[PDB]
């Protein structure tokens, strides 16, 4: 197999040509009719990557690659921009002034994907190591062969990809639309934004809270199965979104089956700059707290920094599988998300009790001090997406006698029958916690079959 650079490929031969290229954009593989699936991509290489820079405006230049197949599984799922694709038997032609490589995977063409970063997106998600730096993480057909001579092509292209992504935006300004101008678009458009929050709306869907360089915040639904790589704090390019005219309560982008959500390789200058520049916005949340009913979700808490890398565990797993699953049994500390249905004891004044450390007994402070050290002994009854349809509510404790969760309310334990200031703050917190669409993101510690909140604090 002889590999040709993108700008050097022949437009006259019409013969099958082969190449290695860096993928910068791609639709998700999609069905067009009863027998065809298509994946369209934008590709670059050392000979084709930037438009005549003078009056060009540092806009990226690229070739396009259209892959045709009879089955969904014969097409590449591009989760990240910057990785490498090797194509065999593509025919080239000019399509409206640009170099279009076409490949019928259902006939004789094939493709193979190589990770530019140490691990592919899927390997990062599952915490797996790559077989080797010359093994494709995905490919069409039952086999893929990498010859000794290709090794240098792959290694050199990787080095170049990192140089390209670190020196240029790659996804240039002409490749997307600012969110505050989304309503002005006639049809679909692209977006480059930071994911501020990933809210599990249900068993199959995530609701992404996005904010781009223009400062505008938008929400969009993202299927869990389709885009399992979405992560809070990360920057993504969204290929094909439309402005939802029927969303009155919040700004919403509608995605289609061909739409795609793409992250960037580690070296990305654009991703680095956006992760630092774009900052969290709680303006939507603050405004919603003034309404009796908020169609916008509000995460009321934040977990300690040391836990911001801990993966979350659903209530279904915490309460129904933690005594039977090997991986769950080996852990005592977990992170989870839920909404509070009811808080016990009902009387907010009883949330703080006097605790006798010798007898391990707590008591009401209505009679005051004679009960011991003041502590919170609060019992939340919660539910989440994984347990949404069942007839259960789950107990999550805020028992601070040993220090766990002491600062949860941003109110040090005090006699609530006497301290009006503390009682009032807690009553207000109670209303926020039980309000529809209010959720808690918390770290819990398993103790004698119960889960106690720790290293978690309200941020409202």
């Amino acid at each position: 197999y002889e590999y040709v650079e993108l700008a050097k490929a022949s437009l006259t031969s019409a013969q099958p040509q082969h190449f290695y290229a860096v993928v910068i954009d791609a639709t998700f593989p999609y069905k067009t009719n009863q027998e065809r699936y298509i994946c369209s991509l934008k590709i670059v290489d050392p000979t084709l990557y930037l438009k005549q820079q003078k009056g060009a405006g540092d806009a990226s230049d690229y070739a396009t690659l259209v892959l045709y197949a009879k089955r969904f599984e014969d097409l590449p799922i591009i989760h990240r921009a910057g990785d490498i694709i090797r194509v065999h038997r593509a025919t080239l032609r000019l399509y409206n002034g640009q170099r279009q490589f076409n490949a019928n995977v259902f006939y004789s063409s094939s493709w193979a994907l190589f990770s530019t970063d140490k691990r592919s997106v899927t390997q990062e998600i599952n915490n797996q190591d790559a077989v080797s730096d010359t093994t494709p993480f995905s490919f069409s057909s039952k086999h893929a062969t990498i010859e000794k001579n290709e090794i240098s092509i792959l290694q050199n292209l990787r080095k170049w990809a990192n140089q390209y992504f670190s020196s240029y935006s790659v996804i240039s300004s002409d490749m997307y639309t600012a969110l505050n101008k989304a309503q002005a678009q006639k049809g679909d458009f692209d977006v480059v934004a930071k994911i501020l929050q990933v809210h599990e709306l249900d068993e199959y869907t995530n609701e992404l809270k996005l904010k781009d360089a223009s400062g505008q915040v938008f929400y969009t639904l993202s299927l869990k199965l389709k885009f399992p790589h979405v992560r809070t704090g990360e920057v993504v390019r969204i290929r094909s979104a439309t402005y939802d005219e029927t969303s009155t309560q919040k700004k919403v982008l509608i995605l289609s089956h061909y739409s795609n959500i793409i992250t960037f390789i580690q070296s990305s200058k654009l991703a680095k700059e956006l992760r630092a520049k774009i900052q969290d916005d709680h303006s939507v949340e603050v405004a919603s707290l003034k309404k009796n009913v908020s169609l916008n979700a509000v995460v009321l808490t934040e977990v300690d920094k040391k836990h911001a890398a801990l993966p979350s565990t659903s209530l279904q797993d915490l309460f129904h599988h933690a005594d039977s699953d090997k991986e769950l049994q080996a852990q005592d500390t977990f992170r989870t998300q839920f909404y509070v249905t009811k808080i016990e004891p009902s009387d907010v004044k009883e949330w703080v009790k006097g605790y006798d450390r010798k007898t391990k007994k707590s008591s009401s402070l209505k009679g005051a001090s004679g009960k011991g050290d003041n502590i919170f002994q609060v019992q939340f009854l919660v539910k989440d997406a994984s347990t949404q349809l069942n007839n259960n509510t789950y107990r999550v404790l805020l028992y601070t006698q040993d220090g766990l969760g002491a600062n949860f309310f941003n109110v040090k334990a005090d006699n609530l029958h006497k301290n009006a200031d503390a009682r009032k703050k807690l009553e207000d917190s109670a209303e926020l916690l039980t309000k529809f669409n209010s959720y808690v993101d918390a770290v819990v510690e398993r103790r004698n079959g119960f889960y106690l909140i720790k290293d978690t604090k309200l941020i409202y």
């Binding site: 249905t341 016990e344 009854l381 949404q388 789950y394 028992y399 079959g449 119960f450």
Partner: protein, 216 residues
């Protein structure tokens, strides 16, 4: 101002405990909708979302009478005008019914519809399943939250707080996590069903039967 007629109608039905008499009267006017599909699923749009109309045996018989030269299962890409209609809430298996969410479905019950054969409609956005809409799913979640919170506050009483000694000095203490599971209502099964809306009832035709009635 809600531009989608279906979204406004269905949202109000859910926001009014499934009571159709409580929904705004200025919304119970004839519905002119584009037929996106007619078989295997009859789906109509309002220019923004698609919903599945549920035809009564009377509705189709009347249709077949005033329009003998018109098969319903072939109305794809054509327009229809629903003059007499009602909405009701039904409990369904959302894993099987795609025009539903969280085991609940607001149904468009059709009693009388006229096919405006060959009327070209205005260009609109690609129609999406109303039951897959972010706000509408959220509206349904609010509806469930209200029912759940009401049931829990009625069922759970007495402040049966975990005794503090159970989580203090838990060095030699081992417990099972299912100790934290509390029943939300007096429901008969593993699924929450304590709702106050009275589940609407109305015989409706299976789209397959109307296909046989028109081409055995």
């Amino acid at each position: 101002q809600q531009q989608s007629a279906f979204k406004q109608l269905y949202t109000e039905l859910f926001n009014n405990e499934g009571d159709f008499s409580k929904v705004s009267s200025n919304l119970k006017k004839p519905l002119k909708c584009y037929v996106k599909e007619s078989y295997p699923h009859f789906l109509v749009t309002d220019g923004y979302f698609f919903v599945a109309p549920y035809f009564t045996k009377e509705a189709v018989n009347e249709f077949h009478a005033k329009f003998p030269n018109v098969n319903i299962v072939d109305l794809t890409d054509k327009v229809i005008v629903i003059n007499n209609w009602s909405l009701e809430l039904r409990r369904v298996n959302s894993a099987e019914v795609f025009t539903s969410y969280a085991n609940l479905e607001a149904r468009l019950i059709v009693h009388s519809f006229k096919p405006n054969l060959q009327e070209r409609l205005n260009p609109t956005r690609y129609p999406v399943n109303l039951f897959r809409d972010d706000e509408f799913k959220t509206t349904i979640q609010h509806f469930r939250h209200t029912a759940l919170q009401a049931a829990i506050n009625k069922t759970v009483k007495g402040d049966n707080l975990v005794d503090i000694s159970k989580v203090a000095d838990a060095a030699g203490k081992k417990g099972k996590v299912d100790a934290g599971i509390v029943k939300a209502s007096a429901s008969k099964g593993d699924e929450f069903s304590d709702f106050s809306f009275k589940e609407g009832n109305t015989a409706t035709l299976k789209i397959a039967d109307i296909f046989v009635q028109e081409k055995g």
